[PDB]
Specification:
- Chain A: Component of a trimeric complex composed of STK11/LKB1, STRAD (STRADA or STRADB) and CAB39/MO25 (CAB39/MO25alpha or CAB39L/MO25beta): the complex tethers STK11/LKB1 in the cytoplasm and stimulates its catalytic activity.
- Chain A: Keywords: Cytoplasm.
- The complex is a heterodimer of chains A (324) and B (281).
- Chain A is mostly helical.
- Chain A has a single domain, classed as Leucine-rich Repeat Variant (Alpha Horseshoe), CATH 1.25.10.10.
- Chain A is built from 21 helices and no strands.
- Helices cover 36% and strands 16% of the residues of chain B.
- In chain B, a hairpin with an 8-residue loop joins strand 1 and strand 2.
- The chains are: A mainly alpha (324), B alpha+beta (281).
- At the A-B interface, helix 6, helix 12 and helix 15 of A face helix 2 and strand 4 of B.
Chain lengths: 324, 281
């Protein structure tokens, strides 16, 4: 029967867990105390046969900024009860979306605690926590001021390794965050891509080359999505200009996989549909003129079904036939 | 990338009902027996992220009443998903050898209900509860198949690879497409119960298209014949046409029928034994 002591009991029992031997002295009691706290804490937040009692929720929040309970929590997390990890996630994720006025107090008092975020992203290296950390991170890059931080980070470009990672589950979860970063906040994301164009696409070009079928497909697909956005118009024009980018898609259209080719196509068509093709594009298109009509004529004509695809196809052929 | 074709050995197939490609298998590293489900991904064709959703959700469960998930491996463009394998069999399987006691039935439902309670608490649900998905270890442990496991706000019926292909265990509010939650699992449980007692679900002999249109219109099915009142009462509890009037799992966990009748989970190995004795080869 207390909504302001559980914190004074974790900044206690959680502080206990580092360092300590695998010794009995803290093996059972000290770790299980932690798990029991996280359950009673999540309770003050979620309605067993009780209600979310507001007065206690205000107290609950202005207790956690005391002092960096979350910092070392998120750090020394790898040594928590499995259901406790899931509990932490649930806890973190709802205080995050707290509101006073039209203002989110959690978000602000993290813009100081700038490292909380990079710990969470460094979680992707430790498989026993990576996923929890994903769940949490995605929940904060969900608020505009927070995405801004990781995007303009040096630590941002660690994703390209986290996405290529060993275990497929984690590689996946990583890619999810990577994606949600670049897509969610539209005006913000388009800002990032303009300024860091050169660097970003060097790495990205590697993904398209690395297979790993899922990495290859998902990022080729995400390219399409980032290209047809409209918010990203500047970025796409720059993109469809480089003849390196057209030779790449051309090879992807030649891929072993039906689904990869089809994806490659939706990017490729934007190159040809371009009203303002620069010279090097026209050169490589004109060079390969015969073999392209040859190809598009017989490219996946089992799909009908797809009015729009065949339409995009007769269109693409007209355009290639019509030069110079 | 470490390729699963040398990490695991595939043994007899068991994916006869749905999409196809579920095998008994062995972890070559540790001699532990697993279930291996292989998904194409190329010939999917319900999106990749849908499948990763299934996994995200499954890997979140660590209950001894829901079948464990051990991880996944990508070979070129097929995905091996490795899960806990239960060598007792399914309750459906075990009925091939003869009927069950009320004590046996209630023992099972108790465990399924614990699984169900665990799921509901994480706002997860099941969505394919049936004797076929009531799975047993060789020492009598009881757990839900991983097949049905899903998130509270996910439509599992739209997607290939998750949909149920028979309307028999489905709640009327689900059939009507309307708003539905965990109370629908409770309904499926009621059906399962009839199924465990009778060997098949209400209206098995009927064409699935007639069924779908009766399940909302008709009165709910009931348990009938040589069964105790509290058993029949448990099944009415579950099978209320109004989702609201259905007890939560926590509440069912202490229904008279369960409390009077459930027993030590070990006693169920007599079933496993009876079955072994029964079958050929």
């Amino acid at each position: 029967a207390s909504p302001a002591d559980i914190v004074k009991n974790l900044k206690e029992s959680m502080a206990v867990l580092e360092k300590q031997d695998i010794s009995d002295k803290k093996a059972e009691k000290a770790t299980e105390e932690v798990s029991k706290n996280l359950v009673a804490m999540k309770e003050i937040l979620y309605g067993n046969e009780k209600e979310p009692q507001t007065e206690a929720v205000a107290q609950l929040a202005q207790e956690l900024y005391n002092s960096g309970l979350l910092s070392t929590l998120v750090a020394d997390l790898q040594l928590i009860d499995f259901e406790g990890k899931k509990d932490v996630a649930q806890i973190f994720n709802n205080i995050l979306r707290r509101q006073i006025g039209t203002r989110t107090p959690t978000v602000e008092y993290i813009c100081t605690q700038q490292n909380i975020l990079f710990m969470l992203l460094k979680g992707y290296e430790s498989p026993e926590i990576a996923l929890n950390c994903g769940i949490m991170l995605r929940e904060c890059i969900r608020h505009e001021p927070l995405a801004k931080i990781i995007l303009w980070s040096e630590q941002f470009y660690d994703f390209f390794r986290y996405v290529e990672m060993s275990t497929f589950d984690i590689a996946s979860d990583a890619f999810a965050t990577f994606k949600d970063l670049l897509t969610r906040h539209k005006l913000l994301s388009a800002e990032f891509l303009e300024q860091h164009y050169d660097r970003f696409f060097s790495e990205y070009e590697k993904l398209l080359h690395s297979e790993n079928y899922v990495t290859k497909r998902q990022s080729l697909k995400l390219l399409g999505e980032l290209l047809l956005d409209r918010h990203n118009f500047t970025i796409m024009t720059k993109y469809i200009s480089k003849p390196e980018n057209l030779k790449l898609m051309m090879n992807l259209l030649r891929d072993k996989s039906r689904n990869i080719q089809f994806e490659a196509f939706h990017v490729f068509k934007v190159f040809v549909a371009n009203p303002n093709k620069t010279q090097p594009i026209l050169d490589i298109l004109l060079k390969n003129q015969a073999k392209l009509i040859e190809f598009l004529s017989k490219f996946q004509n089992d799909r009908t079904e797809d009015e729009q695809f065949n339409d995009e196809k007769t269109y693409l052929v007209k355009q290639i036939r019509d030069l110079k | 990338m470490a390729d699963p074709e040398e990490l695991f050995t595939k043994l007899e197939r068991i994916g006869k009902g749905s999409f196809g490609e579920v095998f008994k298998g062995i972890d070559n590293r540790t001699q532990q027996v697993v279930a291996i489900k292989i998904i194409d991904l190329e010939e999917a064709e319900d999106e990749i992220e849908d499948i990763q959703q299934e996994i995200t959700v499954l890997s979140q469960c660590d209950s001894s009443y829901v079948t464990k998930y051990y991880g996944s491996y990508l070979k070129g463009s097929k995905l091996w998903i490795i899960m806990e394998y239960l060598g007792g069999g399914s309750a459906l399987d075990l009925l091939r050898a003869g009927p069950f006691d009320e004590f046996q039935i209630a023992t099972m439902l108790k465990e399924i209900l614990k699984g169900l309670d665990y799921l509901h608490s994480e706002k997860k649900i099941h969505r394919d509860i049936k004797a076929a998905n009531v799975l047993l270890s060789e020492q009598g442990d009881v757990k839900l198949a991983a097949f049905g496991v899903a998130g509270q706000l996910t439509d599992t019926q739209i997607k290939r690879n998750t949909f149920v292909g028979t309307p028999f265990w489905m709640a009327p509010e689900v059939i009507q497409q309307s708003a539905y939650d965990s109370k629908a699992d409770i309904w499926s449980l009621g059906i399962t119960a009839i199924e465990l007692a009778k060997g098949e679900p209400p209206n098995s002999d009927m064409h699935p298209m007639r069924v779908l249109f009766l399940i909302p219109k008709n009165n709910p099915p009931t348990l009938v014949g040589d069964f105790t009142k509290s058993f029949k009462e448990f099944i009415d509890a579950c099978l209320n046409k109004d989702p609201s009037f259905r007890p939560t799992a926590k509440e069912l966990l202490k229904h008279k029928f369960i409390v009077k009748n459930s027993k030590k989970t070990s006693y169920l190995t007599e079933l496993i034994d009876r079955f072994k004795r029964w079958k050929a080869e």
